[PDB]
């Protein structure tokens, strides 16, 4: 269970860092 | 070390759900899907 709980958090970071990447993009298509 | 782990899975999840509903709400502005 410990290294299920470590690989989730890693995933959802590197999600969380996609997502942000796209409201960056979308916002640079609204300029 | 268990409560920790989950307590951070739950607060990522939660940024995750805002993150996306901002990036559907600009792709409706832009004209994007």
Redesign the interface.
Same mark, same amino acid.
Do not use: P
């Given at each position: 269970?410990?290294k299920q709980?470590?690989d989730?958090?890693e995933e959802?970071?590197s999600?969380?860092y996609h997502? #942000?990447n #796209?409201?960056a993009r979308?916002?640079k298509?609204?300029g």
């Amino acid at each position: 269970r410990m290294k299920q709980l470590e690989d989730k958090v890693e995933e959802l970071l590197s999600k969380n860092y996609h997502l #942000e990447n #796209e409201v960056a993009r979308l916002k640079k298509l609204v300029g």
